[PDB]
Each structure stands twice: as C-alpha cells, then as structure tokens.
Design a protein around this ligand. Sequence first.
Ligand SMILES: [Cl-]
Ligand SMILES: [Cl-]
Ligand SMILES: [Cl-]
Ligand SMILES: [Cl-]
Ligand SMILES: [Cl-]
Ligand code: NA
Ligand code: NA
Ligand code: NA
Ligand code: NA
Ligand code: NA
Ligand code: NA
Ligand SMILES: [Rb+]
Lengths: 311, 311, 311, 311, 311
Amino acid sequence: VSPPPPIADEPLTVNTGIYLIECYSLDDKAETFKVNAFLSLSWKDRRLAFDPVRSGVRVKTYEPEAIWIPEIRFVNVENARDADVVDISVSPDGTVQYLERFSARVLSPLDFRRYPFDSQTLHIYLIVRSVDTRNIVLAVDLEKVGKNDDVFLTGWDIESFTAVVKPANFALEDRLESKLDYQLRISRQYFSYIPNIILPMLFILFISWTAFWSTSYEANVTLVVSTLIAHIFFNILVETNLPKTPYMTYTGAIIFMIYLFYFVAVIEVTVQHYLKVESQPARAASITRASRIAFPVVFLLANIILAFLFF
Amino acid sequence: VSPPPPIADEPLTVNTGIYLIECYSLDDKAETFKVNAFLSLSWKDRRLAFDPVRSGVRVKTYEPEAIWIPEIRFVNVENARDADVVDISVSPDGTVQYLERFSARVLSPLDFRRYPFDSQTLHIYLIVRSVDTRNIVLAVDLEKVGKNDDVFLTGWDIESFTAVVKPANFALEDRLESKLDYQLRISRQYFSYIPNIILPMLFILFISWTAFWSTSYEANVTLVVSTLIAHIFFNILVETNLPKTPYMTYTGAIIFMIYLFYFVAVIEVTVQHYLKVESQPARAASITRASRIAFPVVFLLANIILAFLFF
Amino acid sequence: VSPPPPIADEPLTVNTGIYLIECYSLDDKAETFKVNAFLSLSWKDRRLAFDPVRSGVRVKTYEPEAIWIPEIRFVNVENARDADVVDISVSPDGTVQYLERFSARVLSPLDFRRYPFDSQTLHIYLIVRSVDTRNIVLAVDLEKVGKNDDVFLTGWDIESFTAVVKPANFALEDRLESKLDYQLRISRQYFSYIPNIILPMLFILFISWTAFWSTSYEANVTLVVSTLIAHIFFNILVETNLPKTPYMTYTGAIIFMIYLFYFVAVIEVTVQHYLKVESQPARAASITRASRIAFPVVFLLANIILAFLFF
Amino acid sequence: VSPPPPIADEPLTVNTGIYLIECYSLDDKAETFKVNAFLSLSWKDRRLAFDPVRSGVRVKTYEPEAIWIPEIRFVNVENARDADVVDISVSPDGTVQYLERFSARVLSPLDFRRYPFDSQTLHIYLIVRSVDTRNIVLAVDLEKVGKNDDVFLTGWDIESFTAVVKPANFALEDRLESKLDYQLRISRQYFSYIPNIILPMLFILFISWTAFWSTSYEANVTLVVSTLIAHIFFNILVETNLPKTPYMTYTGAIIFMIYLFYFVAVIEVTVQHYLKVESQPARAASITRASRIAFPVVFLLANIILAFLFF
Amino acid sequence: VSPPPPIADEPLTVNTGIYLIECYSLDDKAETFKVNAFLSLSWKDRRLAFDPVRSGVRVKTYEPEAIWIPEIRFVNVENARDADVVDISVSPDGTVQYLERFSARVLSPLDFRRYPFDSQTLHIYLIVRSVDTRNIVLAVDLEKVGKNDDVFLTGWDIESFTAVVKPANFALEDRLESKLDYQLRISRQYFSYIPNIILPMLFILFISWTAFWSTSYEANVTLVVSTLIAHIFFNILVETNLPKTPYMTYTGAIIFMIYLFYFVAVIEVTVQHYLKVESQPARAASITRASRIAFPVVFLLANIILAFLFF
Ligand SMILES: [Cl-]
Ligand SMILES: [Cl-]
Ligand SMILES: [Cl-]
Ligand SMILES: [Cl-]
Ligand SMILES: [Cl-]
Ligand code: NA
Ligand code: NA
Ligand code: NA
Ligand code: NA
Ligand code: NA
Ligand code: NA
Ligand SMILES: [Rb+]
C-alpha cells in the first residue's frame, strides 16, 4: 500500500479526534497520567471511491491491512499506545473513517509552585511524519473531541478537554512533521490536605508556643524539640508525595519557614533560662511577654506575604 | 465477515453473561480490582442455520475467524481484557453460543465516607458499538450470570453479583452504543481495624487524660506531647491505606477531632502550671477536676454526634 | 481440528501430571505464590494412528497447531499461564504425550490464625470443560507428579506435593467441567521472628516494669510511654507483613494484650503518684509491691491461656 | 535476504543517528534511565538500485521484510528496545534511508562522589556484529544526531547530546563487532536538597549547641539525644534515595561527620554534669565556654576541608 | 524438522557458552538477579553438510525455522528468557554455530550468615531434555564462556564467571536430562554499611554508657530508653534490606546482642536509683564504677567471640 495521490500539489489532511473513556494514575512524582480513549481519523482516498447506485451499498468496511492508513503517533508517551481498531468505513467519494480504542501512559510536566492549590494543563501531542510521495498535515474534527461524563481522575477535578485547532508544522530530520496539542485542564482537590497535613502542622506549632507561658526550661526544651521532630515527620511526608523541583512550592515555603519559627523559639527558651540562672528574671519576663505577641503576629504577616507572592 | 443482515430494520440482540471465577486485588488507593471470569455471548445469525438431518449433527463448532463475532468491550478497564476463546457453538436455527475466559483490571470508584465500616457496589460495564450495516443492542441471560462459591476478595465479604437487565443505549460519535451494568456488591471486613488502629488510638488518648490526676507540669508535657506524636503516627498510617478524598471519612473525622482534644489538653496543662506558678492552685484544682469529667463526656457526646452524622 | 471420537460412549480421559521446578514469591498480603513447572498431558487420538513401516519413525513429533489439544486451564490463577510446549509425541495407536513448561501466579487462601507458627496447603486446580461432541474428564498419572529436590520457597519448609486422584466433575453454565486438586503442603520458618520481633517486644515490656522499683513519677511516665510507643512501632511492623483478617492471629492477640499491660502500668504509675502527693505513700508502696509480682504472673498466665486457645 | 555484496573488499558502512524525543525515569538506585528516540540508519545496497526514467519514481518505499536491514542492537539495555519502523526510502543508486522510533531502559553507571552537586555522562552504546560474507562497520551522521527542545529529565539539567564519531571495532565470539558511544551530559538540580535536607539538618545541629548555654543536665540530655535521633532520620532519608557506594559521597561525608559532633557534645554534657556534682563548676564553666567557640569553629573548618577534598 | 541421526549410537553433544553483557538488580530479599547475555550453541548436523570447493560458499547462514535447533532452557528462571537469535552459521562438515542474545531473571539462593561481609556463588543452570530419536547431552566450550569488562553489579564485586564442565545427566519423567552449572562468584561491597549502620549503632550504644557517669535517674532513663528506640529503628532498617532466614546472620547476632546490653544498662540504672533512695549510695557507687569497665569489656569480648563463630 502507498499514500493517496494528490489531485494538484495539496498536502493530505488527516482529521483527528480524541474521546476520553478513562483517566487514571496521575503520578505527581513521575509527572505521568494513564489514558484510555477513542482515536478517530479521517482522510480522502480517491482510489477507494465507488458508485452508490450500482453497488447498492452506502458504505464499505475494510480491514486495516486492506487499505493505506496514516502512521499517527503520540509524541509524549512512555511506550507506543496499545491500540485496537474498532471500525474502518469508506464513503462513496472515498472518505475514510477510522476508529481505534487505545490506552497510553503520557509524560506531561506539572507546575508544583502552588501545591496543593494547583491547576494543571495536561497535554496529549498527536503527530504525523510526511512521506516522500506527499506531505501529511493534521486537523481537528471538533465534533469528534470529547470525554465520557463518568471520567474521574482520583484527587482531581476535570475542567475541560479541548484541542488547539492549528497544528505545529515543522521540519524534523529532513521531512515535514505535523503536531496537534490536545489539552486536559485539571485542578487539584486540596480538601484532604487541610485536616491531614495543614491543621496538624499548625496545631503542633501552636503547642510549641505554650513555652511562652512557662518558666520551666526542662518542659520548654521538651515542648519545642518534640514538636520540631513532629514537624520533620510532616516535612518528610509531604516531600514523599512530590518530585524534586528547581523552585519552591507554596507548601515547601511554609514548611521551610516553620523551621525558622522553631529555631527562634529555641533561642528564646535558651535566653529565658540563661537570664533566670543569672538572676535577671525581670528581663527574661519582658522577652517572654513580647514573644507571646511577636510569634503569632510575625507568623500571620509572613503567611500573608507568602500567599501574596504565590497567588 | 459482516454482521447478520436484518430481516426488517431490527437491532441485533447480543445476549450476555458473566460468571466470576476469581476476584482479587481490590486496591483502595487506585480504586481498582482484578477479575477472572467467563464471558458468554449469544446472537442469531441466519446465514449459519443448517438442517440437522442433512448435516448429521445437532450443533456446529467454529473457530472465531470463521464467523462474525460482535466486538464487545469493557468500558471501565485499564487495558483491554486478556481473553481466550473457550467455545463457539451454532444451533440448527443459527443461534450462536460464544464462551471466553478473561482477566481484567477494572476501574470502579469507591465511597470512603463510612470507612472502615463501608460497603461498595463495584461495576463491570459491557459495551457494543453499532455498525453501518446494523444496530447492536445488549441483553442479560440471567441463567449465565453468577460466581464460583470459592470466590473470595481478601478483606471483603461478597454479597451479590447481579446485572441491571435494561441496557443504557446512547449515541457516541453518531453511532449507537449499548451498555450493560454488572454489579458486584461487597462489604468491608472492619474486624482488624478494631485491635490494630481504633483501640490503640483510644488507649493513647486515655493515657493523655491521666495528666488530669497530676500536678507535675514536666510529666504532663511528656504525657500529652508523646501521645500526640503517637496519634500523628496513626493518622499517617491510616492515610497511607486511603486515596485523597474531597470529603471527610468516618475515621478521618474521628482522627481529626482527637487532635482538638490533644490541643485543649495542652491548654489545660499550661493553664494549670501557670496558676500554680502564680500561687493560685485552688483555681487550677477546679479546672483540673472539671477536666476529669468534661474530657471523657465531650469525647463520648462528640462520637455519638459523628456516628449519627455518618450512619 | 475437533475432539477424538469415542469407540463406545465413554468420556475422553486426559491424564495429567505437574512436576515443580521452581517455587517463589509466596506473598502473604496478596495470598499468592509463583510457580514454574512441567505440565504433562496424555490422551488417545486414533485419528493419529500410523504404521512405523510406512512413516519410517516409531514415534511422531507434532506442533500444537497441527493436532487437537485439550483446552486445559488453571482455575486459581491471576492471568493465564505462560507456557512453552517442550514436546508432543504421538505413538502408533494414537496415544499423545504432551509436555509443556509453564510459569503462573496462583491465588491460594492462607490461614493466619497461628502466625508465625503456621502451616498451609497451597492448591493448584487443573480444569477442562466438556464439548458437545464429547465429555472430557481428567486423571492423575502419579508417575508424572513431583518436584525438583532444589525447590525452595524462601521463608518456608516444603513438606509434600500430592494430587487428589479423583476429579471433581460438575456442571457449569450447562456443560460438564472436570477439576483436579494438586496440593503443596508448606510450614513457615518462624526462626527469625524470635530475635527480630518477639524478643525485642518482650525486652521493652520488661523495661516498662522497672517502673515498679521507682518512686520517680517523671521517670516512670518516660519508661511506660516510651516503651508503649516502641510497642506501637512493632505492631505497625507486624501488620505490614500481613493482610487484614476477619479473625485474630496468635501474634495479633499477644500484641493486642500487651497494650492492656501498658494501659494498666500507666494506671499504677498514676495511682502511685496521686497517693504520694496525698501523703499516703505506705499505700502506694503496697500497690507497687503487689504490681512487681502481679504483672509478670498475669503476663505468664495470660500467655499460657492464649497458647492453649491457639494451639 | 543476505548482506549487500562488496564492490571491492570494503566493509559495509551503516551510518547512524539518534534523535531524542523523551528522557524520563533517571533512577539513581538502579543507575538506569528511560529513553524514547528516533534511530536513523543509512547504507548502500546495489541490488536495490533503479533507473528513475523507466520506473517513473524518484524514490522507492519498502517493507522491512522485503529488504536486508542491518541487525543493530544496544549494548547497555535491560531488554531489547521496543521499536516501530517509521520509514524505509531507497534512492536510485540504492542508498537506503531507515527510520525507527524506539523506547528503551538504559543501564549507565553514575558517580555519586559529589552528590547532590553531581554531573553525569549517560551512555547509549550502539552495536553491530560482522557476518561471514562481510565486515559491518558503524558511522555517525552528525546531521541526524540531536534532541527535541522540550526534552526534560525531572530533577536534572540536560547539557549536551553528542556522539564519539570513531567506532570501537573488536572481536567478540569470533566475529568482529563495531560499537558507537552516544553521550548525554546531565547535571543534577541540587536546589531542593537545600530547604529539604541540608538546612533542616543544620538547624537541628545548631539546636544541640544551645546545650553550651545550659547548666541543666536533664535538658542538655534531651537537647543532644533528641536532635541526634532526628539526624539519624535524615541519614536514613538520604540513604533511601541512593545506592550503596564503595566510596564516600559529599553528603555522606557531612552526615557521617555530624555524628562525631553529636558524640563529642554528649561527652561535653557528661563532663560538665560530672564536675558540677563533684563541686567543681568553675572548671565545667571553662570547658562549656570554650565549647561555645570550638564547636562552630571546628564545624566550619571541617566543612571547608571536606568541600576542598570533594570539589 | 527432526534431530540429527546418530552415526553409531552416540548422544548428540550440544556445546554451550554464556557471555555476560549486563548484570543488574541483585535483589537480596527476592534472591534474584537480572542478566543480559549471549548464549552460544554448537552441534553437528550431517544432513546440513556441503562441498566447500563446489558450493563456493565457506559458510551457510540459516533462519532458525529452516533448521533443527535443540530446545535449551534455563532451570532457575522466573519466566522463560527473552531471546533474539543473532546468527546461525553452518560449516562444510555440518557444524552448526548458533548465537542468541537473551535477558532473564534468575532465582539463586543466597547465604546471609556473614552479611554484610558475605560472598556468593550465583548459578545459571542450562538444561536440555532428550528426544525419542536420541539422547542430547550438554558440554562447555570454555572459549565461549566469559563476561564484558564493563559488567558491574551495583554494591558487589564480580570475582569470576566459570562453568562446571561435567554436566549432571539424570532421568526425569522417563527421559534423559542434561544440566550444566554456570557459576558467577561475587563479594559484597561492605564499605557503606560502616558509616551508615555500624558506626551510628555503636555511637548510640556508647552514648547509653554515659549513664555510668551520672547519678540523675531521670536523665539516665532518658539516655538508655532514647538510644534503645534508635537501636530498634536500626534493627528495623537492617531487616527491611534482608529476607527472613532460618539462621542468625552476623549483623543480626550483633543487633540482637546489643538489646541485652540495653536491658542490663536499664537494670543497672534501676538498681543505682533504688539504692540511692534506700540511703545506700556507697553501694550504688560500687556497681556504677564496676559497670564503667564491665560494659565495654564484655562488649569487646562478646564481639571477638561472635566474629570467631562467624568467620
Ligand atoms: Cl503512540
Ligand atoms: Cl475490554
Ligand atoms: Cl491457565
Ligand atoms: Cl536493542
Ligand atoms: Cl529459558
Ligand atoms: Na494499512
Ligand atoms: Na469474526
Ligand atoms: Na490444537
Ligand atoms: Na531484513
Ligand atoms: Na527449527
Ligand atoms: Na524529660
Ligand atoms: Rb525533671
């Protein structure tokens, strides 16, 4: 089999569509997601044209091997898609309608800057390489782009699935290449982060501040050091759910900042004890009373500054 | 091969059945389960009809390639099922009886609201896409729906395996699609959660309340902070067995609430010490004595409220 | 290709044998094990009869596709076995000798009641479904059932590999099925559980009992709470190696009981401090002295009772 | 099919090119990386030559089975590459232009000496074995070596992708083998290690040094022992992201050294308490005051020495 | 195709060789390793002999399907090897030279008795089953046994790769079987265990011994209990990198013994406090002073005894 010949000099237009059936396994660390979808293809092949009056048949069904089919690939996949051809239909004018159901693991970078209050645009890049006989170009049939109502991505809200209609046509290894960008817009369900990570982390921090209403050095050391260790556990827990980024994430910033608060609280607890031992408790009392206001106030202002810089 | 032609304009009815052989790997985090079953198919193909007398047989056995077979798929699968055809039998009137043994990983959302005292309805959606030649509709042969007595799903009780007899017929990319819903009802074996998570979590909380029979600030700080950290360990342990949900689970609610009890116990321990230092122990004694009753009472009432809201 | 025809009316007997080459990956949580074995099959197919004089050869060698082969399956497998035909030898009367080497992941439930001092009976169920032309039945050739001397299952002792000679013949979806039960008896190597989990857990418990020779409340709180937390770590460690069971395991029972001992030790430590503060140390001394005997005695008796209930 | 015959006695030159499409999964522990790329091949096959005039075609397309294709393999792969032939074009003189898209898991050793401030040279070794008919040699077509601009390796910066033009020709199993070295130069994005591991580890160490401004043995024991345990947690965390090396890594060196600082701080805390109890606090005071300067100074100098030895 | 016929009554000798290209994934817990190698086979097939002067060709290259090839398998593999035939060469006398490149996951038991100072002998067992026509026996061509210089097994030193030249010929299921033992000798790179596990474990133990220079019960309880818990963390860490063994490993023995030292240190700390409270500090002082010498001395002697028993 060979490509359909051009009537003039025009490139062959392959109309495409992706209909999402299943979305699963959005892996943050790997920056991948798995997809199960319909891929639809359409192009004119005049060699396949027939008479509907004499044939009595409106459509002809072909097996993939019987006809020429464009070699469509995904750019951002781990391995080549697992595909099963569903149908091939030819209209009397020779317009071919191809439909396959496929499954693939897609590589798509994620921006963790606003984590866990982040939104993402996942991409599925469709591609075709031109043949020596003729140039192949891709197009979007919007009537064949969509998603099943039941499509759910655990821990995410699916906003939209659209295609950028204009392909990116470019040369690669001395041939033309035609690339389409299918975009799946998602927003993270931040809910669970509140009772599981955020609030527990704030509770232990506030517990360390009870040391500002205590003169007992021994108890103070226990309060600040114990809660700091619990903070380390939360830091480790958070970093296991995320890849290593060349930038600060919102959660990372807060987690990092909280260490500074524990560090300064240890200095205060130390200074307080030192003055008490040096028979200067009135001074120690002034520092401790100031700390009761300073710590929550600086914590609130630093958080307002951070939220402002990140959102 | 082509579909059986319609005598009038009728859709082709494909009778289905699923007989479960094995159920395994119900993954809560992934919201998947693995299945090994028999899939049975039946439809009328007049072109296959024969005379028993002339042929000298009452049944005819074909190879899948020799005859037309409907392209039946599962909607909610990760990848296409691994299937092996067992038998194809034709009756004199062209009634085809198809049997395959398959294995598949099924995506089925889970409701964790009542975890670990939850029940689920797992779905296996069977689907067929109509052809240009004819419309294909699915039906349930109840005599061919069932499960082996030995079918066990580790950590779950299997209640029933039934099919919703009326298919959900709908248009998808200008073709009729016929969808059947096979339902596997299961209930979680909550037993082990009691000695492993629930009771240990209650024991550490009750241990934190012994601080209401102690005047020692240093010992109190140790009792409350240590038990809080152990509570954080249980919270982390629980959240590892579950996906992130945009709602509160029953266990999640209790775990979250217990933090508030630890937070208020730290306030009480702090207030008690502060008053003792300020030479007002009679007051501190009133707060501590009230706490001995208030803490267990509020804990019991809050749990009754939560159980009521969740069950 | 169709089944061999009956001389009279008898069912076709397929003689079977399983020879184990490798046993690996007994996964307690999944209740699976991997197997690499020889599957031997033997049946008479008179349509394959030949004259050694004419054909030259005394035994014919065939390719699986060239002849009829019974569709033998495993019941309790995750996916269909990976098999490679080693030989298909046909003798002059038409007796076929089939040999394949296969690998499979077998689902076989485990009884954890006596863990880690438990024994198991793993099953490999061989099955054949009857056809319309004729009924197929399975038999065991004991001369072809066995295991390699080097077969080792990490963490287990292999006792025996035998087959229940009588097949279970039954109706399934309006056709006969013939099922054979191959049994692999194993016993767990409990050795490592003693220095790794059992003894460390007993040491920390005995360490908490040193609080019965101390009047220091602060030190007592540290002894009992610290060792309790280490006990929680061991409980978590143990539960990670096991699935969730709707029953108590032997280890689970001991682990659970030890929590009660920690809970009562905290009560004793609290009661002792309370009386000391109330200027009644003589009483506190009576309770502490009784505790020195009561705790180890009740621990020993409770363990005798548990061992009796479980073994 | 057989190799192209030599016009004289020359070896057959197979021109190669690798164009990287995707780079993912650089696993430090496994010392592997996954690659998705174009592999281009070019060689002259006289037997396939044609006259453009009598053919009416300027180029001829073939199926891989129709013509002789060199058996090109990768040396450093886990399993053989998953490849899909994209195009095979033949020019009039019989110059073949082969293009495949492949995916492979590459084994490439990593030098962790400067971790996490390390750079690596990943290798992809292309190989061909000679035949009895003729010697097959590999060459690099520099015009066909490259990478997509969007190629991103999570946690790394990609510097260059070049090929060593001269192949390594040698005998292997009595046939000559022609090996090409494709080099991917990368540098680790160390950013995240600073707020996640480095700074938290320094904060806890500095917190242990507050014991040099405290006379309280009980509080000192708590400060030093608690922070040491948190240091053990960071040591464990770091070692989980790395394979076991027969050398010291930069991070490993610092982590190890910090243990010595904790060990000496415990000695100081012990010596201080001992002298205090022995009624010699003036002495203890001299040791403690010296420690306040000595600990940070020796820490800074040891770090300058280490950075010097490693960079 | 059928086997080559015997000239007299001799078994067919299949000469073998394994040349290691890659060694990776030595999994201690699973007792497996992955291998990528060349497998060479050689045997005489007279039915394939040809005239060198008449034919003009010195060697004939065949496709695997065109000729008879012995069915060679590996005994100790998880699944059948992934193999790709590289070349088949026939010399005039009919000597066949077969070469394939394969990848396999090999099951090979490991002796952990001396861990982490252990050495292992990994096995790759090659096997052939005889046919009815004739007996097939295996031999080693030492000229075709070896390994690439770049072969590295992360965390191990590769010593030698040799074959036991004499096959183990035995009857299995009424046919002869010929088995060859290929041995890969390796020694563990123990280096990293020293700064990561051994030294940190010794540091915490020595820190517990500072309690012998302290009269503070409260501080002593904190020193011994805290360090014991850190020892439990190291015990857990070590046991995660190892399978469960029916014997004691060297590291396991030391780890277990260290618990006894912590247990006796708690007794000493308890006895010391008890005597102090009973107004007998002179005695307590004798026990504490003896402990300062006894603990390190008994620790050193017990380690010399253990090293002697294990090495
Ligand atoms: Cl693709
Ligand atoms: Cl499917
Ligand atoms: Cl099977
Ligand atoms: Cl390859
Ligand atoms: Cl093999
Ligand atoms: Na085609
Ligand atoms: Na068909
Ligand atoms: Na067959
Ligand atoms: Na070829
Ligand atoms: Na062959
Ligand atoms: Na303390
Ligand atoms: Rb104290």
